[PDB]
């Protein structure tokens, strides 16, 4: 018991007693005076080196640096952004809602503004870090993207092969650099930037060029580990390259140097599967999802090089992935938690009384025993699938979906469903009534094409005619009663 007998018995004084006889607004004595820092960069660099896990702490560091200086060190800003992204980097247990909250926070916007203001200070050695942070936070910044992409295209021959692979995967995830023309320009309509069509394809072709050059200039230098190849790439890098090619639908890609050229996707799959056994595959992780998704999308879209792409992967690997798909792979690979736009549209649908809208509902071909994709909402009586695009637009009023949702769109097309995509950059501008009106107009274009399946709670219908007259008084018909009426 902390009673402090010294105080309670009347031997010592209390701070409150002493201060009750002083002016109310005296200044507390600074017990310890230590010299304040002269250079802020090193101080905040040390603090950031200490902080890696709490986005609250990272943002507090940035806010304090902003309060102290109006032009914090650009390298420190880049490091802070990278740490914030790594907090959400691809293996965490965060929901997408947490990333959306961070994006909405004003401090995050101030950090992005500070980055944009001096974007000319970005060196070539920080572009992969920023692209990784963008992919992790699912925040596609069209202000900064042109400069980063210019750096990437300029340093094409100087990047490391695994860096090329990771950059291609991140760009495909963000939905940039695809093969569709007139869809890879940044800026407002009056001031449009360069067209970045085929950037991921050029990255993949550079990787293919290096791999072919290995055949001519092979070497037996030390490898970082058993899973690393001569170029320093692990199976994850090749699997991610294949996944990005699948996301952009560049199945028929090949290095133009030769007519008899093997598929680049086939090469990537082969070199991803070469150093892996079945026991290792069971624990590889994202590699399983990437490989099975590549095979499944290739089968669904039946491209020209489907046979070669399938022959790339070992049959034992295919069998293991097929039999283990529903155990952990898809559940661990799909986005976790909640999406705010999904919740908003779900509330709108409930208001409109669409009772057959299934959240995160999968669809597939008539003869597939397993489904590899999930729609944000599946209106199943109308053959409709509602998808949600919460990314930033390429410019004011120029939205675009991510590679994930583009591949899902193609898959749903192949399956035979109609696809309606809600773009948040437009949706957020509306209010409740306008949202309801526009959703009603959307549903008007897809009238009920089938009857809706009910999920009714079971009941004893045969008793529907029974009447409970609460407040019906007890009747005393006879004395003595022959029956004790309740």
């Amino acid at each position: 018991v902390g009673v402090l007998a010294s105080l309670t018995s009347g031997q010592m004084t209390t701070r409150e007693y002493e201060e009750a006889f002083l002016p109310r607004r005296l200044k507390r004595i600074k017990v310890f005076n230590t010299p304040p820092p002269s250079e802020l960069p090193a101080f905040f660099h040390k603090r950031l080196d200490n902080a890696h896990s709490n986005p609250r702490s990272i943002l507090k560091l940035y806010r304090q640096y902003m309060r102290k200086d109006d032009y914090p060190a650009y390298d420190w800003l880049v490091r802070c952004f990278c740490h914030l992204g790594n907090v959400f980097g691809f293996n965490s247990f965060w929901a997408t809602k947490d990333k959306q909250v961070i994006q909405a926070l004003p401090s995050f916007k101030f950090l992005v503004y500070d980055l944009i203001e001096r974007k000319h200070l970005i060196e070539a050695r920080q572009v992969p870090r920023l692209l990784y942070a963008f992919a992790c936070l699912e925040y596609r910044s069209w202000h900064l993207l042109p400069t980063l992409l210019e750096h990437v295209e300029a340093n094409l021959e100087k990047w490391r092969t695994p860096t090329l692979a990771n950059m291609a995967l991140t760009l495909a995830l963000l939905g940039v650099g695809d093969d569709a023309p007139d869809h890879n320009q940044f800026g407002p309509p009056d001031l449009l930037s360069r067209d970045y069509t085929g950037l991921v394809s050029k990255l993949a072709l550079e990787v293919h060029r290096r791999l072919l050059a290995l055949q001519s200039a092979s070497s037996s230098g030390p490898r970082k580990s058993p899973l690393h190849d001569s170029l320093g790439c692990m199976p994850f890098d090749y699997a991610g390259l294949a996944f990005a090619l699948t996301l952009q639908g560049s199945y028929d890609l090949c290095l133009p140097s030769d007519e008899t050229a093997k598929s680049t996707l086939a090469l990537f799959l082969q070199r991803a599967c070469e150093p892996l056994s079945l026991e290792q595959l069971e624990n590889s992780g994202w590699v399983q999802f990437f490989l099975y998704q590549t095979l499944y999308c290739v089968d669904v879209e039946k491209p020209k090089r489907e046979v070669e792409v399938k022959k790339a992967v070992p049959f034992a690997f295919q069998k293991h992935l097929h039999l283990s798909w529903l155990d952990k792979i898809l559940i661990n690979a799909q986005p976790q938690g909640n999406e705010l736009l999904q919740l908003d549209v779900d509330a709108a649908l409930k208001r409109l009384h669409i009772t057959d809208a299934l959240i995160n509902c999968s669809a597939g071909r008539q003869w597939d025993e397993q489904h590899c994709w999930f729609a944000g909402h599946l209106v199943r009586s109308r053959n409709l699938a509602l998808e949600y695009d919460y990314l930033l637009p390429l410019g004011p009023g120029r939205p675009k979906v991510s590679g994930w949702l583009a591949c899902k769109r193609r898959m749903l097309k192949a399956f035979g469903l109609n696809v309606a995509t809600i773009h948040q950059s437009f949706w957020s501008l509306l209010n409740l009534e306008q949202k309801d009106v526009q959703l009603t107009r959307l549903l008007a274009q897809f009238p009920p094409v089938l009857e809706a399946v009910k999920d009714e709670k079971k009941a004893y219908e045969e008793d529907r005619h029974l009447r409970f007259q609460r407040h019906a008084r007890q009747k005393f018909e006879t004395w003595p009663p022959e029956k004790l009426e309740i």
Binding site: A95, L326, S362, K458, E461
Partner: protein, 213 residues
């Protein structure tokens, strides 16, 4: 009041009675196995029946929880795993996947819930006069029967009461757990056995203790 003025015990005595426990004669042992290990958490996943889809965003994505509760619906068209409709429910906290609401969602639409009351004694019998819902229960030889059609009317279309051939077992079945429990507990409150004579009803696995004068 509290928050603006100290109590006499907290002021003069420092609330020592809070720590003046003896620590023996406990009704339970303390939890000594925690050890503050800081164990490795994992992403647990369960494949619930597709009827779990009845619980939508209001339950899965709109409730406030410490960690995310991921939900997905796999709707495809002896058991082999692949080729059936089900619901993936995942989280980093296994306690979420043991919620009774998830099982209630399925049971409400598939099979419901049931309870049993057991009657004992001489001249104790439950029957219908002449059919459902004219449930009657007599609790002795000279005892007039109890009319219970009102409870059947109360819980019509969601619960039913079945009687045994011997008129000694009353099974309450239904499709809402709370309603079934309330119906059964009214019936039990109202047919409860007298411990000195033992004539009456008792809830299954909860026998009444016989008393002696």
């Amino acid at each position: 009041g509290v928050g603006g003025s100290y109590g006499y015990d907290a002021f003069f005595r420092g609330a020592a009675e809070v720590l003046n426990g003896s620590n023996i004669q406990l009704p339970h042992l303390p939890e000594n196995e925690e050890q503050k290990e800081g164990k490795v958490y994992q992403l647990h996943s369960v494949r619930f029946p597709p009827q779990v889809r009845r619980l939508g965003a209001n339950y899965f994505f709109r409730r406030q929880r410490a960690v995310p509760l991921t939900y997905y619906h796999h709707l495809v068209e002896a058991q082999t795993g692949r080729g059936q409709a089900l619901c993936f429910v995942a989280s980093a906290n296994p306690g979420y996947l043991q919620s009774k609401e998830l099982e209630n969602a399925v049971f409400e639409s598939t099979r419901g819930f049931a309870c049993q009351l057991i009657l004992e004694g001489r001249g104790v019998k439950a029957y219908f006069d002449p059919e459902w819902p004219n449930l009657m229960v007599r609790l002795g030889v000279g005892v007039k029967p109890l009319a219970l059609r009102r409870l059947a009317e109360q819980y019509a279309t969601r619960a039913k009461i079945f009687v045994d051939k011997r008129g000694l077992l009353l099974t309450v079945h239904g499709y809402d757990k709370c309603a079934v429990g309330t119906l059964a507990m009214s019936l039990f409150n109202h047919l409860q056995a007298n411990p000195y004579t033992m004539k009456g009803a008792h809830v299954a696995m909860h026998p009444i203790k016989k008393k002696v004068t």
